[PDB]
Protein backbone atom coordinates (compact mmCIF):
# COMPACT_ATOMS: atom_id res chain seq x y z
CA UNK A 1 0.00 0.00 0.00
CA UNK A 2 1.45 3.34 -1.10
CA UNK A 3 1.77 5.84 1.76
CA UNK A 4 1.13 9.50 0.89
CA UNK A 5 1.98 12.50 3.09
CA UNK A 6 -0.53 15.35 2.86
CA UNK A 7 0.09 18.51 4.91
CA UNK A 8 -2.89 20.73 5.73
CA UNK A 9 -2.23 24.43 6.39
CA UNK A 10 -4.37 27.54 6.86
CA UNK A 11 -5.48 29.97 9.56
CA UNK A 12 -6.84 28.76 12.87
CA UNK A 13 -10.61 28.36 13.15
CA UNK A 14 -11.23 27.53 9.49
CA UNK A 15 -12.42 24.04 10.42
CA UNK A 16 -9.33 22.04 9.41
CA UNK A 17 -9.23 19.64 12.36
CA UNK A 18 -13.01 19.11 12.23
CA UNK A 19 -12.80 18.17 8.53
CA UNK A 20 -9.88 15.79 9.04
CA UNK A 21 -11.54 14.01 11.99
CA UNK A 22 -14.86 13.77 10.13
CA UNK A 23 -13.34 12.33 6.96
CA UNK A 24 -10.95 9.87 8.61
CA UNK A 25 -13.49 8.58 11.16
CA UNK A 26 -16.39 8.51 8.67
CA UNK A 27 -18.60 10.40 11.11
CA UNK A 28 -20.66 13.57 11.17
CA UNK A 29 -18.75 16.42 12.86
CA UNK A 30 -21.13 16.75 15.80
CA UNK A 31 -20.43 13.13 16.79
CA UNK A 32 -16.64 13.31 16.90
CA UNK A 33 -14.81 11.53 19.71
CA UNK A 34 -12.28 14.07 21.05
CA UNK A 35 -8.66 12.97 20.81
CA UNK A 36 -5.66 14.51 22.55
CA UNK A 37 -3.33 13.47 19.70
CA UNK A 38 -2.57 15.30 16.46
CA UNK A 39 -2.77 14.10 12.83
CA UNK A 40 -4.99 11.55 11.07
CA UNK A 41 -4.80 8.68 8.60
CA UNK A 42 -7.13 6.78 6.30
CA UNK A 43 -6.99 3.80 3.97
CA UNK A 44 -8.46 5.05 0.70
CA UNK A 45 -9.20 3.58 -2.72
CA UNK A 46 -8.56 5.98 -5.61
CA UNK A 47 -8.83 4.94 -9.27
CA UNK A 48 -8.41 1.29 -8.32
CA UNK A 49 -5.28 1.87 -6.20
CA UNK A 50 -5.31 1.47 -2.40
CA UNK A 51 -3.36 4.13 -0.53
CA UNK A 52 -2.68 5.10 3.06
CA UNK A 53 -3.25 8.85 3.30
CA UNK A 54 -1.41 10.56 6.17
CA UNK A 55 -2.87 13.94 7.11
CA UNK A 56 -0.70 16.44 9.01
CA UNK A 57 -2.80 18.92 11.00
CA UNK A 58 -0.70 22.07 11.48
CA UNK A 59 -1.16 24.99 13.86
CA UNK A 60 -1.78 28.11 11.81
CA UNK A 61 -1.22 30.81 14.42
CA UNK A 62 1.85 33.05 14.24
CA UNK A 63 3.39 31.57 17.42
CA UNK A 64 3.95 28.33 15.48
CA UNK A 65 5.44 29.97 12.35
CA UNK A 66 9.04 29.20 13.30
CA UNK A 67 8.76 25.41 13.72
CA UNK A 68 5.83 24.59 11.40
CA UNK A 69 8.00 24.18 8.24
CA UNK A 70 9.85 21.29 9.90
CA UNK A 71 6.77 19.24 9.01
CA UNK A 72 7.20 20.00 5.30
CA UNK A 73 10.08 17.67 4.26
CA UNK A 74 8.75 14.52 2.52
CA UNK A 75 5.35 16.10 1.77
CA UNK A 76 3.59 14.85 -1.38
CA UNK A 77 0.75 17.39 -1.54
CA UNK A 78 -0.42 20.47 0.35
CA UNK A 79 -3.95 21.51 1.18
CA UNK A 80 -4.15 25.26 1.76
CA UNK A 81 -7.43 25.84 3.58
CA UNK A 82 -9.52 28.94 4.18
CA UNK A 83 -13.08 29.41 5.39
CA UNK A 84 -15.57 30.65 2.79
CA UNK A 85 -17.15 32.77 5.54
CA UNK A 86 -13.83 34.28 6.73
CA UNK A 87 -12.43 36.86 4.28
CA UNK A 88 -9.42 37.26 6.59
CA UNK A 89 -8.48 33.59 6.22
CA UNK A 90 -8.90 33.93 2.45
CA UNK A 91 -6.57 36.93 2.22
CA UNK A 92 -3.94 34.97 4.18
CA UNK A 93 -3.87 32.35 1.40
CA UNK A 94 -2.08 35.02 -0.64
CA UNK A 95 -0.31 36.92 2.15
CA UNK A 96 0.95 33.95 4.19
CA UNK A 97 0.25 30.35 3.19
CA UNK A 98 1.11 30.28 -0.52
CA UNK A 99 4.44 32.12 0.06
CA UNK A 100 5.36 29.93 3.04
CA UNK A 101 4.68 26.65 1.22
CA UNK A 102 6.58 27.76 -1.90
CA UNK A 103 9.62 29.07 -0.03
CA UNK A 104 10.06 25.55 1.37
CA UNK A 105 8.48 23.35 -1.32
CA UNK A 106 8.80 24.96 -4.77
CA UNK A 107 7.38 22.02 -6.76
CA UNK A 108 4.86 20.29 -4.49
CA UNK A 109 1.24 20.37 -5.75
CA UNK A 110 -1.08 22.70 -3.85
CA UNK A 111 -4.84 22.23 -3.60
CA UNK A 112 -6.86 25.23 -2.45
CA UNK A 113 -9.76 24.23 -0.18
CA UNK A 114 -12.65 26.50 0.78
CA UNK A 115 -14.28 25.21 3.97
CA UNK A 116 -17.62 25.81 5.69
CA UNK A 117 -19.49 25.74 2.38
CA UNK A 118 -22.78 25.26 4.25
CA UNK A 119 -22.39 28.65 5.94
CA UNK A 120 -22.04 30.68 2.73
CA UNK A 121 -25.85 30.65 2.36
CA UNK A 122 -26.53 30.59 6.11
CA UNK A 123 -28.77 33.56 6.95
CA UNK A 124 -27.32 33.83 10.46
CA UNK A 125 -23.71 33.74 9.23
CA UNK A 126 -24.52 36.21 6.45
CA UNK A 127 -25.95 38.78 8.87
CA UNK A 128 -23.02 38.61 11.31
CA UNK A 129 -20.58 39.21 8.45
CA UNK A 130 -22.65 42.25 7.46
CA UNK A 131 -22.00 43.65 10.95
CA UNK A 132 -18.34 44.09 9.90
CA UNK A 133 -19.14 45.05 6.27
CA UNK A 134 -18.05 41.65 4.97
CA UNK A 135 -19.52 38.96 2.72
CA UNK A 136 -18.64 35.30 2.10
CA UNK A 137 -16.11 34.26 -0.51
CA UNK A 138 -17.87 33.33 -3.74
CA UNK A 139 -16.88 30.41 -5.94
CA UNK A 140 -15.51 32.71 -8.71
CA UNK A 141 -13.38 34.50 -6.11
CA UNK A 142 -12.04 31.20 -4.77
CA UNK A 143 -11.25 30.01 -8.29
CA UNK A 144 -9.52 33.30 -9.06
CA UNK A 145 -7.31 32.79 -6.01
CA UNK A 146 -6.48 29.23 -7.09
CA UNK A 147 -5.39 30.62 -10.46
CA UNK A 148 -3.28 33.30 -8.78
CA UNK A 149 -1.38 30.81 -6.58
CA UNK A 150 -1.02 28.09 -9.20
CA UNK A 151 -3.05 25.49 -7.32
CA UNK A 152 -3.77 22.33 -9.26
CA UNK A 153 -7.35 22.13 -7.89
CA UNK A 154 -9.90 24.40 -6.22
CA UNK A 155 -12.41 22.57 -4.04
CA UNK A 156 -15.16 23.68 -1.64
CA UNK A 157 -16.50 21.42 1.11
CA UNK A 158 -18.68 21.23 4.21
CA UNK A 159 -17.93 18.92 7.12
CA UNK A 160 -21.50 19.44 8.35
CA UNK A 161 -23.26 18.41 5.13
CA UNK A 162 -20.31 16.25 3.91
CA UNK A 163 -20.68 17.84 0.46
CA UNK A 164 -17.33 17.93 -1.34
CA UNK A 165 -15.47 16.22 1.50
CA UNK A 166 -14.68 12.94 -0.26
CA UNK A 167 -13.54 14.88 -3.32
CA UNK A 168 -10.95 16.95 -1.41
CA UNK A 169 -9.02 13.86 -0.37
CA UNK A 170 -9.55 11.89 -3.58
CA UNK A 171 -8.09 14.85 -5.47
CA UNK A 172 -5.25 15.26 -2.96
CA UNK A 173 -4.27 11.68 -3.83
CA UNK A 174 -4.80 12.14 -7.60
CA UNK A 175 -2.44 15.15 -7.51
CA UNK A 176 0.28 12.74 -6.33
CA UNK A 177 -0.54 9.47 -8.15
Amino acid sequence: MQAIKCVVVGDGAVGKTCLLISYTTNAFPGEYIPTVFDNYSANVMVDGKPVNLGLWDTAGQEDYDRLRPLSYPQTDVFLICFSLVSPASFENVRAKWYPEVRHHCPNTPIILVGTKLDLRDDKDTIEKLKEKKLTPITYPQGLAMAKEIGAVKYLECSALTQRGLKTVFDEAIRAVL
Partner: protein, 276 residues
Amino acid sequence: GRYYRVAFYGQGFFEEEEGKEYIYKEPKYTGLSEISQRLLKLYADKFGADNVKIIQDSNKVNPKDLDPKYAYIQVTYVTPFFEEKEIEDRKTDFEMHHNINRFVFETPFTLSGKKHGGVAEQCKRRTVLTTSHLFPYVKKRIQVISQSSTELNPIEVAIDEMSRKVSELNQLCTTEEVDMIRLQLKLQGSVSVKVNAGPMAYARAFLEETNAKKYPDNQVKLLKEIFRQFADACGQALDVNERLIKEDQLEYQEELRSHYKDMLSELSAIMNEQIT
Protein backbone atom coordinates in the same frame (compact mmCIF):
# COMPACT_ATOMS: atom_id res chain seq x y z
CA GLY B 1 -17.49 -4.10 3.33
CA ARG B 2 -18.40 -0.89 5.17
CA TYR B 3 -21.28 -1.17 7.62
CA TYR B 4 -23.77 1.54 8.64
CA ARG B 5 -26.62 1.78 11.10
CA VAL B 6 -29.73 3.19 9.42
CA ALA B 7 -32.91 3.91 11.38
CA PHE B 8 -36.20 5.25 10.00
CA TYR B 9 -38.57 7.61 11.81
CA GLY B 10 -41.52 9.07 9.96
CA GLN B 11 -45.04 8.26 11.06
CA GLY B 12 -46.66 9.94 8.08
CA PHE B 13 -44.20 8.50 5.57
CA PHE B 14 -42.65 5.11 6.27
CA GLU B 15 -44.73 1.95 6.26
CA GLU B 16 -42.95 -1.40 6.81
CA GLU B 17 -39.73 0.45 7.72
CA GLU B 18 -41.28 2.80 10.31
CA GLY B 19 -39.47 2.62 13.64
CA LYS B 20 -37.05 -0.04 12.37
CA GLU B 21 -33.26 -0.04 12.51
CA TYR B 22 -30.93 -1.87 10.13
CA ILE B 23 -27.29 -2.51 9.45
CA TYR B 24 -26.53 -1.79 5.77
CA LYS B 25 -23.53 -3.50 4.20
CA GLU B 26 -21.89 -1.19 1.63
CA PRO B 27 -19.01 -1.84 -0.79
CA LYS B 28 -15.53 -1.55 0.64
CA TYR B 29 -14.33 2.07 0.99
CA THR B 30 -17.88 3.50 0.95
CA GLY B 31 -17.88 6.79 2.85
CA LEU B 32 -20.59 8.42 4.92
CA SER B 33 -21.59 10.97 2.29
CA GLU B 34 -22.10 8.24 -0.33
CA ILE B 35 -24.62 6.14 1.59
CA SER B 36 -26.29 9.19 3.17
CA GLN B 37 -26.84 10.85 -0.21
CA ARG B 38 -28.17 7.64 -1.79
CA LEU B 39 -30.62 7.10 1.05
CA LEU B 40 -31.68 10.75 0.96
CA LYS B 41 -32.35 10.66 -2.78
CA LEU B 42 -34.13 7.29 -2.62
CA TYR B 43 -36.63 8.36 0.03
CA ALA B 44 -36.92 11.90 -1.36
CA ASP B 45 -38.19 10.33 -4.59
CA LYS B 46 -40.91 8.60 -2.54
CA PHE B 47 -41.85 11.38 -0.11
CA GLY B 48 -40.71 14.63 -1.75
CA ALA B 49 -37.25 16.21 -1.49
CA ASP B 50 -38.30 18.94 0.93
CA ASN B 51 -39.71 16.25 3.26
CA VAL B 52 -36.70 14.04 4.11
CA LYS B 53 -33.93 14.81 6.61
CA ILE B 54 -30.83 12.99 7.85
CA ILE B 55 -30.38 12.60 11.60
CA GLN B 56 -26.67 13.02 12.31
CA ASP B 57 -26.93 12.52 16.08
CA SER B 58 -25.80 8.98 16.91
CA ASN B 59 -27.64 8.85 20.25
CA LYS B 60 -30.85 6.83 20.38
CA VAL B 61 -33.60 8.92 18.84
CA ASN B 62 -36.48 10.08 21.01
CA PRO B 63 -39.28 10.60 18.44
CA LYS B 64 -40.79 13.40 20.54
CA ASP B 65 -37.93 15.57 19.19
CA LEU B 66 -38.99 15.06 15.57
CA ASP B 67 -41.20 17.26 13.42
CA PRO B 68 -44.07 15.12 12.01
CA LYS B 69 -43.86 17.10 8.76
CA TYR B 70 -40.64 15.25 7.88
CA ALA B 71 -39.37 11.73 7.35
CA TYR B 72 -36.07 11.14 9.14
CA ILE B 73 -33.18 8.76 8.45
CA GLN B 74 -30.49 8.31 11.11
CA VAL B 75 -27.16 7.15 9.64
CA THR B 76 -24.10 6.13 11.67
CA TYR B 77 -20.94 4.29 10.65
CA VAL B 78 -20.41 1.07 12.63
CA THR B 79 -17.69 -1.57 12.70
CA PRO B 80 -17.94 -5.32 13.33
CA PHE B 81 -17.73 -6.03 17.06
CA PHE B 82 -15.88 -8.94 18.65
CA GLU B 83 -15.20 -9.79 22.26
CA GLU B 84 -11.67 -10.88 23.15
CA LYS B 85 -12.87 -14.50 23.20
CA GLU B 86 -14.06 -14.10 19.60
CA ILE B 87 -10.99 -12.21 18.39
CA GLU B 88 -8.72 -15.19 19.17
CA ASP B 89 -10.83 -18.01 17.67
CA ARG B 90 -10.88 -16.10 14.36
CA LYS B 91 -7.49 -16.74 12.72
CA THR B 92 -7.75 -15.41 9.17
CA ASP B 93 -9.29 -12.15 8.02
CA PHE B 94 -11.90 -14.30 6.25
CA GLU B 95 -13.12 -15.04 9.77
CA MET B 96 -13.56 -11.45 11.01
CA HIS B 97 -15.39 -10.72 7.74
CA HIS B 98 -17.60 -13.85 7.96
CA ASN B 99 -20.56 -14.73 10.19
CA ILE B 100 -20.95 -11.38 11.90
CA ASN B 101 -24.09 -10.06 13.57
CA ARG B 102 -22.73 -7.50 16.06
CA PHE B 103 -21.64 -3.95 15.25
CA VAL B 104 -20.33 -1.13 17.44
CA PHE B 105 -20.26 2.67 17.39
CA GLU B 106 -19.21 5.30 19.93
CA THR B 107 -21.13 8.38 21.09
CA PRO B 108 -19.63 11.35 22.98
CA PHE B 109 -21.47 12.77 25.97
CA THR B 110 -20.89 14.53 29.27
CA LEU B 111 -22.85 14.37 32.50
CA SER B 112 -23.77 18.06 32.33
CA GLY B 113 -25.80 17.39 29.19
CA LYS B 114 -23.31 19.04 26.87
CA LYS B 115 -22.13 16.62 24.21
CA HIS B 116 -18.43 17.55 24.40
CA GLY B 117 -16.01 18.77 27.02
CA GLY B 118 -12.37 18.84 28.02
CA VAL B 119 -10.57 15.70 29.13
CA ALA B 120 -11.86 15.95 32.72
CA GLU B 121 -15.51 16.01 31.52
CA GLN B 122 -15.64 13.95 28.32
CA CYS B 123 -17.37 10.57 28.60
CA LYS B 124 -17.95 8.01 25.85
CA ARG B 125 -20.70 5.48 25.14
CA ARG B 126 -20.07 2.23 23.26
CA THR B 127 -23.20 0.79 21.66
CA VAL B 128 -23.31 -2.71 20.18
CA LEU B 129 -26.15 -3.57 17.79
CA THR B 130 -27.14 -7.18 17.06
CA THR B 131 -28.82 -8.16 13.80
CA SER B 132 -31.47 -10.84 13.31
CA HIS B 133 -29.29 -12.72 10.78
CA LEU B 134 -25.57 -13.11 10.12
CA PHE B 135 -23.62 -11.42 7.37
CA PRO B 136 -22.85 -12.43 4.68
CA TYR B 137 -26.50 -12.41 3.70
CA VAL B 138 -28.70 -12.42 0.60
CA LYS B 139 -29.96 -8.91 1.42
CA LYS B 140 -27.91 -5.70 1.61
CA ARG B 141 -29.39 -4.82 5.01
CA ILE B 142 -30.42 -6.75 8.13
CA GLN B 143 -32.72 -5.60 10.91
CA VAL B 144 -31.25 -4.78 14.32
CA ILE B 145 -33.12 -6.71 17.02
CA SER B 146 -31.24 -5.72 20.20
CA GLN B 147 -28.70 -3.26 21.50
CA SER B 148 -26.30 -3.20 24.43
CA SER B 149 -24.24 -0.34 25.72
CA THR B 150 -21.50 0.53 28.17
CA GLU B 151 -20.11 3.91 29.13
CA LEU B 152 -16.65 5.20 30.02
CA ASN B 153 -16.12 8.03 32.51
CA PRO B 154 -13.32 10.58 31.94
CA ILE B 155 -10.46 8.66 33.55
CA GLU B 156 -11.60 5.53 31.74
CA VAL B 157 -11.49 7.48 28.46
CA ALA B 158 -7.94 8.54 29.30
CA ILE B 159 -6.92 4.96 30.16
CA ASP B 160 -8.48 3.67 26.93
CA GLU B 161 -6.93 6.26 24.61
CA MET B 162 -3.48 6.07 26.24
CA SER B 163 -3.45 2.25 26.29
CA ARG B 164 -4.36 2.10 22.63
CA LYS B 165 -1.63 4.63 21.77
CA VAL B 166 1.02 2.52 23.53
CA SER B 167 0.00 -0.56 21.51
CA GLU B 168 -0.09 1.44 18.28
CA LEU B 169 3.39 2.92 18.76
CA ASN B 170 4.86 -0.42 19.83
CA GLN B 171 3.31 -2.08 16.77
CA LEU B 172 4.93 0.46 14.44
CA CYS B 173 8.36 -0.14 16.01
CA THR B 174 8.22 -3.93 15.66
CA THR B 175 6.99 -4.01 12.05
CA GLU B 176 9.56 -5.76 9.87
CA GLU B 177 9.64 -2.97 7.24
CA VAL B 178 8.60 0.23 8.99
CA ASP B 179 6.69 2.72 6.84
CA MET B 180 8.52 5.90 7.81
CA ILE B 181 5.69 8.27 6.87
CA ARG B 182 3.15 6.36 8.96
CA LEU B 183 5.58 6.18 11.88
CA GLN B 184 6.23 9.92 11.75
CA LEU B 185 2.54 10.84 11.64
CA LYS B 186 1.87 8.92 14.87
CA LEU B 187 5.16 9.86 16.55
CA GLN B 188 4.82 13.60 15.88
CA GLY B 189 1.16 13.32 16.81
CA SER B 190 2.23 11.98 20.24
CA VAL B 191 5.32 13.96 21.32
CA SER B 192 4.70 17.26 19.50
CA VAL B 193 0.98 18.04 19.81
CA LYS B 194 0.16 21.65 18.98
CA VAL B 195 -3.52 21.61 17.91
CA ASN B 196 -5.31 19.16 20.22
CA ALA B 197 -4.92 18.93 23.99
CA GLY B 198 -1.88 16.61 24.00
CA PRO B 199 -1.42 13.45 26.08
CA MET B 200 -0.12 15.54 28.98
CA ALA B 201 -3.66 16.91 29.28
CA TYR B 202 -4.60 13.51 30.74
CA ALA B 203 -1.63 13.61 33.12
CA ARG B 204 -2.54 17.11 34.32
CA ALA B 205 -6.22 16.26 34.78
CA PHE B 206 -5.88 12.88 36.48
CA LEU B 207 -2.36 12.43 37.93
CA GLU B 208 -1.55 15.84 39.42
CA GLU B 209 -1.53 15.83 43.21
CA THR B 210 -2.74 19.44 43.43
CA ASN B 211 -6.11 18.36 42.01
CA ALA B 212 -8.85 17.24 44.35
CA LYS B 213 -9.00 13.46 44.43
CA LYS B 214 -11.88 12.08 42.37
CA TYR B 215 -11.10 8.60 41.08
CA PRO B 216 -10.21 5.28 42.75
CA ASP B 217 -6.55 4.85 43.67
CA ASN B 218 -6.30 1.73 41.51
CA GLN B 219 -7.42 3.61 38.40
CA VAL B 220 -4.94 6.42 39.01
CA LYS B 221 -2.25 3.78 39.52
CA LEU B 222 -3.22 2.10 36.23
CA LEU B 223 -3.07 5.39 34.32
CA LYS B 224 0.36 6.10 35.81
CA GLU B 225 1.66 2.76 34.58
CA ILE B 226 0.27 3.38 31.09
CA PHE B 227 2.04 6.76 31.00
CA ARG B 228 5.30 5.01 31.91
CA GLN B 229 4.70 2.70 28.95
CA PHE B 230 3.78 5.65 26.72
CA ALA B 231 7.04 7.42 27.59
CA ASP B 232 8.92 4.25 26.70
CA ALA B 233 7.02 3.73 23.44
CA CYS B 234 7.67 7.32 22.35
CA GLY B 235 11.39 6.91 23.01
CA GLN B 236 11.53 3.67 21.03
CA ALA B 237 9.62 5.25 18.13
CA LEU B 238 12.03 8.19 18.20
CA ASP B 239 14.98 5.80 17.96
CA VAL B 240 13.42 3.94 15.02
CA ASN B 241 12.80 7.24 13.23
CA GLU B 242 16.44 8.21 13.82
CA ARG B 243 17.59 5.23 11.73
CA LEU B 244 15.05 5.83 8.95
CA ILE B 245 15.44 9.55 8.28
CA LYS B 246 17.63 11.04 5.59
CA GLU B 247 19.47 14.36 5.81
CA ASP B 248 16.38 16.44 4.96
CA GLN B 249 14.75 15.47 8.28
CA LEU B 250 17.66 15.89 10.72
CA GLU B 251 16.33 19.21 12.02
CA TYR B 252 12.80 17.80 12.22
CA GLN B 253 14.04 14.79 14.21
CA GLU B 254 16.00 16.91 16.66
CA GLU B 255 12.89 19.02 17.27
CA LEU B 256 10.84 15.89 17.96
CA ARG B 257 13.51 14.83 20.45
CA SER B 258 13.41 18.22 22.18
CA HIS B 259 9.61 18.06 22.51
CA TYR B 260 9.90 14.48 23.77
CA LYS B 261 12.42 15.53 26.43
CA ASP B 262 10.16 18.41 27.51
CA MET B 263 7.20 16.03 27.79
CA LEU B 264 9.22 13.65 29.99
CA SER B 265 10.33 16.57 32.16
CA GLU B 266 6.70 17.59 32.73
CA LEU B 267 5.57 14.00 33.34
CA SER B 268 8.41 13.51 35.83
CA ALA B 269 7.28 16.57 37.78
CA ILE B 270 3.67 15.37 37.85
CA MET B 271 4.49 11.80 38.90
CA ASN B 272 7.44 12.65 41.21
CA GLU B 273 9.52 10.03 39.36
CA GLN B 274 12.52 10.39 37.10
CA ILE B 275 10.95 9.27 33.82
CA THR B 276 13.59 8.26 31.22
